[PDB]
Design an enzyme around this catalytic site. Structure first.
Site, mmCIF file in Angstrom:
data_model
loop_
_atom_site.group_PDB
_atom_site.id
_atom_site.type_symbol
_atom_site.label_atom_id
_atom_site.label_comp_id
_atom_site.label_asym_id
_atom_site.label_seq_id
_atom_site.Cartn_x
_atom_site.Cartn_y
_atom_site.Cartn_z
ATOM 1 N N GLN A 46 -6.225 -17.440 -3.320
ATOM 2 C CA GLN A 46 -6.405 -16.537 -4.455
ATOM 3 C C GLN A 46 -7.649 -16.903 -5.267
ATOM 4 O O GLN A 46 -8.453 -16.024 -5.598
ATOM 5 C CB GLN A 46 -5.163 -16.529 -5.339
ATOM 6 C CG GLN A 46 -3.957 -15.868 -4.695
ATOM 7 C CD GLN A 46 -4.000 -14.358 -4.779
ATOM 8 O OE1 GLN A 46 -4.603 -13.790 -5.689
ATOM 9 N NE2 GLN A 46 -3.344 -13.695 -3.832
ATOM 10 N N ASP A 75 -8.339 -0.319 -7.972
ATOM 11 C CA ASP A 75 -7.616 -0.648 -6.744
ATOM 12 C C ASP A 75 -7.100 -2.079 -6.743
ATOM 13 O O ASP A 75 -6.110 -2.390 -6.078
ATOM 14 C CB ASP A 75 -8.512 -0.422 -5.528
ATOM 15 C CG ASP A 75 -7.739 -0.382 -4.228
ATOM 16 O OD1 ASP A 75 -8.374 -0.465 -3.160
ATOM 17 O OD2 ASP A 75 -6.498 -0.263 -4.265
ATOM 18 N N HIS A 78 1.609 1.502 -5.772
ATOM 19 C CA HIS A 78 0.193 1.161 -5.814
ATOM 20 C C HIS A 78 -0.607 2.363 -6.303
ATOM 21 O O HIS A 78 -1.484 2.229 -7.162
ATOM 22 C CB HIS A 78 -0.277 0.718 -4.426
ATOM 23 C CG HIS A 78 -1.721 0.323 -4.361
ATOM 24 N ND1 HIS A 78 -2.214 -0.810 -4.972
ATOM 25 C CD2 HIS A 78 -2.772 0.895 -3.724
ATOM 26 C CE1 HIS A 78 -3.511 -0.908 -4.727
ATOM 27 N NE2 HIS A 78 -3.875 0.114 -3.973
ATOM 28 N N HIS A 117 -5.811 7.567 -2.722
ATOM 29 C CA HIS A 117 -6.764 6.685 -2.046
ATOM 30 C C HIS A 117 -6.171 5.897 -0.872
ATOM 31 O O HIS A 117 -6.900 5.457 0.026
ATOM 32 C CB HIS A 117 -7.427 5.741 -3.056
ATOM 33 C CG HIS A 117 -6.642 4.497 -3.333
ATOM 34 N ND1 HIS A 117 -5.623 4.449 -4.257
ATOM 35 C CD2 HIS A 117 -6.732 3.252 -2.808
ATOM 36 C CE1 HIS A 117 -5.120 3.228 -4.290
ATOM 37 N NE2 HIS A 117 -5.772 2.483 -3.417
ATOM 38 N N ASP A 118 -4.853 5.707 -0.894
ATOM 39 C CA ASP A 118 -4.173 4.947 0.152
ATOM 40 C C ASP A 118 -3.110 5.758 0.887
ATOM 41 O O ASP A 118 -2.191 5.183 1.471
ATOM 42 C CB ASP A 118 -3.587 3.639 -0.402
ATOM 43 C CG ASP A 118 -4.557 2.474 -0.309
ATOM 44 O OD1 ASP A 118 -5.474 2.501 0.533
ATOM 45 O OD2 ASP A 118 -4.404 1.515 -1.086
ATOM 46 N N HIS A 143 0.826 -1.209 0.000
ATOM 47 C CA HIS A 143 0.000 0.000 0.000
ATOM 48 C C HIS A 143 0.859 1.256 0.000
ATOM 49 O O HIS A 143 0.857 2.030 0.960
ATOM 50 C CB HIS A 143 -0.932 0.000 1.201
ATOM 51 C CG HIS A 143 -2.074 -0.952 1.073
ATOM 52 N ND1 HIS A 143 -2.030 -2.237 1.566
ATOM 53 C CD2 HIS A 143 -3.292 -0.809 0.500
ATOM 54 C CE1 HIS A 143 -3.172 -2.845 1.304
ATOM 55 N NE2 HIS A 143 -3.954 -1.999 0.659
HETATM 56 C C1 LIG Z 1 -4.891 -6.710 -4.575
HETATM 57 C C2 LIG Z 1 -5.523 -7.632 -3.558
HETATM 58 N N1 LIG Z 1 -5.517 -8.968 -3.412
HETATM 59 C C3 LIG Z 1 -6.182 -9.533 -2.394
HETATM 60 C C4 LIG Z 1 -6.254 -10.897 -2.137
HETATM 61 C C5 LIG Z 1 -6.993 -11.290 -1.025
HETATM 62 O O1 LIG Z 1 -7.066 -12.588 -0.764
HETATM 63 C C6 LIG Z 1 -5.842 -13.343 -0.558
HETATM 64 C C7 LIG Z 1 -6.049 -14.552 0.326
HETATM 65 C C8 LIG Z 1 -7.327 -14.952 0.704
HETATM 66 C C9 LIG Z 1 -7.496 -16.066 1.521
HETATM 67 C C10 LIG Z 1 -6.374 -16.766 1.949
HETATM 68 C C11 LIG Z 1 -6.511 -17.885 2.763
HETATM 69 C C12 LIG Z 1 -5.371 -18.568 3.182
HETATM 70 C C13 LIG Z 1 -4.102 -18.139 2.791
HETATM 71 C C14 LIG Z 1 -3.971 -17.020 1.971
HETATM 72 C C15 LIG Z 1 -5.106 -16.330 1.547
HETATM 73 N N2 LIG Z 1 -4.970 -15.246 0.751
HETATM 74 C C16 LIG Z 1 -7.658 -10.411 -0.176
HETATM 75 C C17 LIG Z 1 -7.599 -9.040 -0.418
HETATM 76 C C18 LIG Z 1 -6.851 -8.670 -1.532
HETATM 77 S S1 LIG Z 1 -6.489 -7.131 -2.216
HETATM 78 NI NI NI Z 2 -5.608 0.685 -2.532
HETATM 79 NI NI NI Z 3 -7.128 0.870 0.704
#
Ligand SMILES: Cc1nc2cc(OCc3ccc4ccccc4n3)ccc2s1
Ligand code: NI
Ligand code: NI
Length: 330
Positions: free
Chosen positions: A281, A229, A84, A118-119, A80
């Site tokens: 993911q 974002d 970004h 925004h961040d 962040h």
């Molecule tokens: C740019 C962004 N990517 C993400 C990915 C996310 O998820 C990643 C995620 C979700 C669940 C999981 C469970 C176990 C291990 C890793 C994990 N990563 C959550 C918020 C943002 S913002």
């Molecule tokens: Ni952001």
């Molecule tokens: Ni943010």
């Protein structure tokens, strides 16, 4: 903490910045990556701004001030951060271009600015953390904690001497653009996203959606802010996977802080749980990104390259789960 005023030596070069040729075509694209051009970002922004609302859009002596001052107020945190900011801003630019006449100058410049801001002053710690462990800010802002701080910082930066770049606007236009920004930032709080998505999806599938409707407009800008974002999910595979490293670096550091006070953090913020990333993911794409982009396709069809890429990146993540994961250099 307050706001630190930038030194006068930084904007000394930027006013002289000319954009390389080969990028003039490349920038216009959605999947374009700013990564390789760190020393060019402060100019890349200016260029995008000049292209989307003209050369005399801002007092260039103060725009250059505004930028390099914003650059400073991003902490050297792993995700962040300054990179970004520009990455998101670029995705806005890209959307704005492919939908140009749908938005006022006020809106276009308003958004571009909001995106880069925004961040602002992100500490590398989530809303969950600040709210579960009573950080001063959480009682300052009960909901959308960090986003509200992001706004106040943007405000404070503008209020500082020789920064206000919306001064050449009427007190009527000023009230509106600061609002367009207020809403823009607040929407980047993923909390508000899901609800916002469904509504927009309902509205559209029933033909209710009209962009002359100020409430519908808000919500469309809303999903725009979310699309941008998260645009790291819309880049080519290898960039997507590297950016992913930056996010977990920051996520896990927060997890390291919840371990130091007897609360096993959610698997996502636990470096000891790397195995769950590819599945983790999948979830985020299926539950969030795909929805985000699918919806935005329907509302704004010229944004479809964003979804085309995202489906590919999910397709890549499934391929990573199956064990077909390809080479990486750490
Ligand atoms: C740019 C962004 N990517 C993400 C990915 C996310 O998820 C990643 C995620 C979700 C669940 C999981 C469970 C176990 C291990 C890793 C994990 N990563 C959550 C918020 C943002 S913002
Ligand atoms: Ni952001
Ligand atoms: Ni943010």
């Amino acid at each position: 903490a307050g706001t630190s005023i930038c030194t006068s030596e930084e904007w000394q070069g930027l006013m002289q910045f000319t954009l390389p040729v080969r990028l003039c075509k490349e920038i216009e694209l959605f999947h374009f990556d700013i990564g390789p051009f760190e020393n060019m970002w402060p100019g890349i922004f200016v260029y995008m701004v000049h292209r989307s609302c003209g050369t005399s859009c801002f007092e260039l002596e103060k725009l250059c001030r505004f930028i390099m001052s914003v650059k400073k107020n991003y902490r050297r945190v792993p995700y962040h951060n300054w990179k970004h900011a520009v990455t998101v801003a670029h995705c806005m630019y890209a959307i704005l271009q492919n939908n140009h006449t749908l938005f006022t100058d006020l809106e276009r410049k308003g958004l571009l600015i909001a995106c880069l801001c925004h961040d602002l002053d992100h500490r590398g710690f989530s809303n969950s953390y600040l709210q579960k462990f009573d950080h001063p800010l959480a009682a300052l802002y009960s909901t959308s904690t960090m986003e509200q701080h992001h706004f106040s910082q943007t405000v404070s930066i503008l209020q500082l001497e020789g920064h206000n770049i919306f001064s050449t606007l009427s007190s009527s236009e000023y009230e509106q653009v600061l609002e367009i920004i207020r809403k823009a930032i607040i929407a980047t709080d993923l909390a508000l996203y899901f609800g916002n998505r469904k509504q927009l999806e309902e509205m559209y599938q029933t033909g209710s959606l009209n962009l002359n409707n100020q409430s519908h407009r808000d919500r469309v800008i809303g999903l725009m802010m979310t699309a941008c974002d998260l645009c790291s999910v819309t880049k080519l595979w290898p960039v997507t996977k590297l950016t992913a490293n930056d996010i977990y670096a920051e996520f896990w550091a927060e997890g390291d802080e919840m371990k130091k006070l007897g609360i096993q953090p959610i698997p996502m913020m636990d470096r000891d749980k790397k195995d769950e990333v590819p599945q983790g993911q999948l979830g985020f794409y299926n539950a969030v990104a795909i929805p985000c982009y699918t919806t935005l396709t329907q509302i704004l069809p010229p944004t479809e390259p964003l979804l085309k890429a995202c489906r590919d990146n999910l397709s890549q993540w499934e391929k990573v789960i199956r064990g077909e994961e390809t080479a990486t250099w750490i």
